[PDB]
RNA sequence: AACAUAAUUAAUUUCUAGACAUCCGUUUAUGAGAGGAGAUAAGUCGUAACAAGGUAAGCAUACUGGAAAGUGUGCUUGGAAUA
RNA sequence: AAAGGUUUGGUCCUGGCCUUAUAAUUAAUUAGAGGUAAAAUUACACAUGCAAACCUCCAUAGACCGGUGUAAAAUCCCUUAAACAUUUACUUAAAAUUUAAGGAGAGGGUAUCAAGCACAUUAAAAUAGCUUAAGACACCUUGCCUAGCCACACCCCCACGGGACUCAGCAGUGAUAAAUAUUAAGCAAUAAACGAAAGUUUGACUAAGUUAUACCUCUUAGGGUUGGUAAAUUUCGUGCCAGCCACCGCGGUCAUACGAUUAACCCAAACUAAUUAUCUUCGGCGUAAAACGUGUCAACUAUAAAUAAAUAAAUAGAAUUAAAAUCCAACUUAUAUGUGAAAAUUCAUUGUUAGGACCUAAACUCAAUAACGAAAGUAAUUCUAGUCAUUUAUAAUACACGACAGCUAAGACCCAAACUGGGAUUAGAUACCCCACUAUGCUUAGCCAUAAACCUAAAUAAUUAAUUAACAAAACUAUUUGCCAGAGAACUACUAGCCAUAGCUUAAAACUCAAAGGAC
């Protein structure tokens, strides 16, 4: 049995379900939440379930969490321009908190798709090379082309050993 | 252990694989120094043929000679291999029959 | 890290080596000396190419001509036998400055500056002359300067535009139709912007390398 | 130690010279001689433990003894407990 | 891992070892031919030949290619700036390739390497800081990041200098090693260098030679095995011998286990042996390895409540005393004492005292009680001081404690008692039993820091059903820390700290074994 409570949180599939990919402006997200209370239940669930997913998709964003420092829970984002975006998450479900931050400071689906395509621009199917980078190592693999001499011996007249003998014979 | 304790320690530390009589090498070449008999620890009863050899590394070891009858003498050259002789305690080397001075067992 | 220790000897060697080079720089009289019997340079023991043997015995170096002239021939015109044979149009340098090698016992090695007129076309500024140590130079006489320097330019006949390569022309015309541009104009390359100098055109002596001072 | 010549094309020269030698230490090998552990394995002297093992056993500690061990003090049951 | 063999008289649990799969190197035995890939003991010393030129002189190139794995925890990934020993463009910009200063994160081993010792900041020049159990520092080992990268180039990290003065370029040799390719051909292709160019050059490379190391196509057949795990034995010989096994094991006269035969089995141009590598923590801690002798304070990780205490033996101090001893005195038996029975011891004894002294030592009944305290520990009586609120769990390298025994100095001393002496017993009796008497148990100061310090149960908050390995003490979830990783060697060696000096805490390896261990 996987240790801890809700061990599904420690699976790559769960971490990849996060949908909040912050814009490049976002640099820090401080989380102020209270461990005891009734109006902070969604905030506690947000730290338990959602903070891992956010960090997984935003590795370069500093997430620092402070406990029981204020009467109410809130989220404050620090942007590269110097702006500070304060969010109040009291009486809000953990799902509601995720949706709010996605709207205000989350990249749109269109932007993310464009970045994905740009990443793969330099992979070409026609390119030949090692398996790590290319589909086929050699043109011998292609159908109709002359096969590899190791797998299929070449005709004698196509061999340097034979041609050299003729040149000596001439 | 807790997940915090597994994190602070990481994977189990692995003791290093200490080498044996051949020092992690398939074979060694040695010069015979003495030929003697060793008695197998009970419950077995025999006069097992062994020899002391000076290995190429420079150390000296005791090597069991397998087969029925050997012509080995002092100053001969032999190729030793690994493998302990189960009844003979401390004998962790064996001589290879058919290499250098040691020869194949004479078939009867 | 912090175990990458300093290397005092390496730094000392670099500086010391560089200093010795400046102190013991060779001179033109030594680097470009020649043994005419073997046509081999004593400094490095480099034998000149075979195609240069005839001229090394039959032609003069630039400062051999200039050492015999007042003011080292400032203002005089000098041409090269290679140019005289290759180009019908006048090719010459108009000498402006000349720094002889005082060390030479005949003042036959040095540097020069002047204004180039190649194939009848004259440059606008003076620059250092290359290949001054070559056995190829011919001083122009003062009385023959007017006839030598007389040149009338012919109208340029080298094509200014050419067709595009067969495939590259089809790719251009195909793009026109795709973009809606309808025309039967033939794509044409413009060669005026990228016209090549002759292969023997004088090069920039200022940016050229000099041989080292270690004898072979 | 870093200036001085030169200057009616302009350049020359300086742009240095000692001392970077020992180290204080730090590891490893050698081992006079003195010990330990284990195995070889027919023995010797006792019978300490396992039965209430014939004085229940053991722990810490002290002293004592051919040898296991003995005795004291507190503690444990991984002993017993009706006459 | 779809697992298997092996602890026992037997079963169950726990747990190590080994087997079955895969690949490389070497060795034994054995092999035809062809195609392909790869070639590898050694940063050891190198005989000879070659590996860099080109070209109208100047220049450019010889900084590459090729080689090795030297050094170094060395790096990976990323940011910034700047040039470039360049290219191609412009009189001003696109690249390729580098260099310098850095840092989100990641990055080998040993903590018996626990402290490093200037490792910081400010900018009147003062302040006293910086790194480190979230692993500094020290030491050891290693090429990694793999379309490739990094370091090295005879040695002295460097290379002015000095020295033991160059193949870690191709082929080749010496020595060494278990480890064994041609002192070969050509610049025709591609790549590089040079030239404006026709072209020239190249041990890069191309095409060959060599080699069962691998793959592929064919042809021949050899190699090992045959007790179990694990596919497969006939007969004889041997007789605990000769030999055999990876593990368990086999051989003392009917050996399916050895040797030779016979027949079968497996793989097959190979086959078997040795060596090496490939598999790697969500499991446990009453009885099997494992909860620390005890408590308190930090930083994290978790948790969420707002109290506690409220005269039964905590602790410390002072005072106090009932019973039984001891001493002294009076009287007094002739013996007293002691054992299963004796002996020695003793008559300086013995018994009585409603006689005196003593205040040493220890606290019956209550106690069939289950309180107090962190634990250790604490119960004769009285008085004084005194336990109490941090939400909760979680601490060492700090602090304060810690039975008994023991050490140090000065006292106490009723009784008990190691040692010692005397007496018995016994084959002996350095013991058990008897008698005597010390250290010691007591007080006051200090040390020592160990217990089967064991409820053999870490603490805390839940649950009692959607739950029998065995036994013990019903099962089980969550949180945090500690601890464990076969047995012995080993409460050991070395290291460091300590009032400890025949000490305590900390705590390995070689080597040996195939088990050890728990419950029934
Ligand atoms: S791998 Fe393509 S010819 Fe061999
Ligand atoms: K046997
Ligand atoms: K006993
Ligand atoms: K006994
Ligand atoms: K007993
Ligand atoms: K097993
Ligand atoms: K070096
Ligand atoms: K070529
Ligand atoms: K028989
Ligand atoms: K057999
Ligand atoms: K057989
Ligand atoms: K107990
Ligand atoms: Mg030229
Ligand atoms: Mg007994
Ligand atoms: Mg007895
Ligand atoms: Mg004891
Ligand atoms: Mg005694
Ligand atoms: Mg006694
Ligand atoms: Mg071989
Ligand atoms: Mg290379
Ligand atoms: Mg190395
Ligand atoms: Mg040590
Ligand atoms: Mg060097
Ligand atoms: Mg060498
Ligand atoms: Mg060399
Ligand atoms: Mg070589
Ligand atoms: Mg080989
Ligand atoms: Mg070119
Ligand atoms: Mg056999
Ligand atoms: Mg067998
Ligand atoms: Mg235990
Ligand atoms: Mg006695
Ligand atoms: Mg006394
Ligand atoms: Mg202890
Ligand atoms: Mg106790
Ligand atoms: Mg102890
Ligand atoms: Mg000790
Ligand atoms: Mg010690």
DSSP character string of chain C: -------HHHHHHHHHHHHHHHHT---HHHHT--BTTTTB-TTT-PBPPGGGHHHHHHSB-HHHHHTTSGGGGTT-EEEEHHHHHH-SS--EEEEEEEEE-TTSTT---EEEEEEEEETTEEPSS-EEPS-TTSS-EEEPPSTTHHHHT---PPPP-S-SEEEPPHHHHHHHHHHHHHHT----PPPEEE-SSS-PPPTTSPP-STT-----S---
C-alpha dist (Å) from residue A46 to A73, A93, B3: 11, 8, 21
Q: What is the spatial distance between Cα A166 and Cα A157, in angstroms, rounded to a whole number? A: 10
Q: Helix, strand or coil for residue B81?
A: strand
Q: Report the DSSP beta bridge partners of residue A22.
A: A106
Residues in B touching A4 (Cβ below 8 Å) = 3
* Six-digit token string for A145: 């082309």
Please tell me the experimental approach by which this structure was elucidated: cryo-EM
Angle at C143 between CA C139 and CA C147, to 5 degrees: 85
- Closest CA relative to residue A30, chosen from A66, A83, A82: A66
Quote the distance between the C-alpha of residue C146 and its chain's center.
Answer: 26
Residue in this structure with the two tokens 């931050």, named with its chain if needed = A101
d(CA C169, CA C163): 8
Go through A146-155 and write b for each residue having 16 or more CB atoms within 10 A of its CB, e for each that does not: eeeeeeeeee
Ligand 1 atom closest to the Cα of residue A151 is 4
**Residue A59 structure tokens:** 């590795």
Partners of B3 on chain A (C-beta within 8 Å) are 3-4
Distance of CA A49 to the CA centre of its chain: 19
The HSE-up count of residue C5 (CA atoms within 13 Å, CB side) is 3
Task: Give resolution, Å, one decimal.
Answer: 3.1
The gap between B40 CA and D45 C1' (Å) is: 30
First to last CA, chain A: 80
At residue C74's C-alpha, the angle toward residues C69 and C77, to 5°, is 90
Instruction: For residue A121, give both structure tokens.
Output: 């621009």
CA atoms within 13 Å, Cβ hemisphere of C18: 6
Q: Which residues line ligand 1 at a C-beta cut-off of 6 Å?
A: A 138, 140, 148, 150
Cβ atoms of residues C80 and C91 within 8 Å: yes
Spatial separation of the C-alpha atoms in residues B100 and B98, rounded to whole Å: 7
Task: Name which of C215, C211, C214 is nearest C17 in CA terms.
Answer: C214
Which helix (H) or strand (E) covers residue A119, if one does?
helix A109-119
CA distance C197 to A33: 77
Say which residue the tokens 């005949």 belong to.
C106
Name, in order, each residue with C-beta under 8 angstroms of B73's C-beta and a sequence gap of 6 or more.
B32, B35
Neighbours of B21 (CB within 10 A): 21
Sign of CA dihedral A51, A55, A58, A64: positive
C-alpha distance from B7 to closest chain A C-alpha (Å): 13
Cβ neighbours of C121 (radius 10 Å):
12
> By the 8 A CB rule, do A118 and A66 touch?
no
Residue of B nearest to A5 (CA): B3
Q: Are A48 and A2 in contact (CB under 8 A)?
A: no
3-state secondary structure of B42: coil
Distance CA C198, CA A7 (A): 78
* Sign, CA torsion A40/A41/A44/A46: negative
Chains that touch A (3 or more CB pairs under 8 A): B
Beta bridge partners of residue C192, listed in sequence order: none
Chain B interface includes A3 (CB < 8 A): yes
Expressed in angstroms and rounded, the spacing between residue A163 Cα and the centre of ligand 8 is: 17
Q: Is the dihedral of CA B45, B51, B55, B61 positive or negative?
A: positive
C-alpha angle C69-C73-C75 in degrees, rounded to nearest 5:
150
Cα angle C140, C146, C150; round to 5: 105
Nearest nt to C95, CA vs C1'?
A: D9
Instruction: Report CA(C13)–ligand 14 centroid distance (Å).
Output: 88
Q: Are A54 and A100 in contact (CB under 8 A)?
A: no
Percent helix, strand and coil across chain B, each rounded to 5?
5, 30, 65
| DSSP symbols for C108-140 | --EEEEEEEEETTEEPSS-EEPS-TTSS-EEEP
Contact by Cβ (8 Å): B27, B96 = yes
Between positions 1 and 40 of B, the ones with CB within 8 A of A are 2-3
Interface of A with B in 78-107 (CB under 8 A): none
Question: Is the minimum CB–CB distance between A122 and chain B shorter than 8 Å?
Answer: no
């Amino acid at each position: 049995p996987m240790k801890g409570r809700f061990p599904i949180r420690r699976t790559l599939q769960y971490l990849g379900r996060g949908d909040v990919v912050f814009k490049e402006s976002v640099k820090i997200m401080t989380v102020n939440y209270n461990t005891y209370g009734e109006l902070g239940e969604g905030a506690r669930k947000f730290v338990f379930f959602n903070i891992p997913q956010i960090q997984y998709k935003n590795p370069w964003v500093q997430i620092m969490m402070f406990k029981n420092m204020t009467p109410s829970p809130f989220l404050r984002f620090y942007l590269d321009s110097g702006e500070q975006v304060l969010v109040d998450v009291e009486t809000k479900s953990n799902k509601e908190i995720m949706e709010h931050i996605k709207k205000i400071l989350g990249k749109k689906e269109e932007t993310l798709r464009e970045e994905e395509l740009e990443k793969q621009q330099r992979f070409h199917p026609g390119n030949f090379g090692p398996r790590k980078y290319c589909l086929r190592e050699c043109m011998c693999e292609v159908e109709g082309q002359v096969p590899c001499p190791g797998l299929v011996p070449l005709p004698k007249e196509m061999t340097g050993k034979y041609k050299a003998a003729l040149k000596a014979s001439t | 252990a807790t997940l915090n304790q597994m994190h602070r320690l990481g994977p189990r530390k692995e003791p290093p694989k200490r080498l044996g009589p051949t020092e992690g090498r398939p074979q060694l070449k040695g010069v015979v120094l003495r030929t003697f008999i060793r008695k197998p620890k009970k419950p077995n009863s025999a006069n097992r043929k062994c020899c002391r050899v000076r290995l190429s590394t420079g150390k000296e070891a005791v090597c069991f000679i397998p087969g029925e009858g050997h012509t080995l003498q002092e100053h001969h050259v032999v190729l030793v291999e690994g493998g302990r002789t189960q009844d003979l305690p401390g004998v962790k080397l064996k001589v290879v029959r058919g290499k250098y001075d040691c020869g194949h067992v004479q078939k009867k | 890290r912090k175990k990458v220790r300093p290397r005092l000897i390496a730094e000392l060697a670099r500086r010391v080596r560089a200093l010795r080079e400046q102190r013991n720089q060779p001179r033109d009289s030594q680097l470009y000396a020649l043994d005419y019997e073997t046509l081999t340079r004593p400094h490095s023991g480099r034998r000149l190419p075979v195609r240069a043997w005839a001229d090394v015995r039959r032609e003069s170096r630039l400062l051999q001509l200039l050492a015999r002239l007042p003011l080292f021939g400032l203002g005089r015109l000098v041409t090269r036998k290679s140019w005289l044979w290759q180009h019908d149009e006048p090719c010459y340098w108009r000498l402006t400055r000349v720094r002889p090698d005082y060390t030479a016992q005949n003042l036959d090695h040095g540097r020069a500056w002047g204004i180039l007129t190649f194939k009848g076309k004259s440059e606008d500024t003076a620059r250092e002359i290359e290949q001054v140590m070559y056995h190829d130079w011919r001083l122009v006489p003062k009385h023959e300067e007017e006839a030598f320097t007389a040149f009338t330019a012919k109208p340029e006949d080298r094509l200014n535009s050419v067709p595009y390569p067969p495939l590259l022309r089809a790719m251009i015309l195909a793009e026109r139709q795709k973009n809606g541009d309808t025309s039967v104009q033939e794509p044409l390359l413009n060669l005026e912007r990228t016209r090549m100098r002759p292969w023997d055109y004088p090069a920039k002596q200022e940016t050229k390398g000099r041989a080292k001072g270690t004898p072979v």
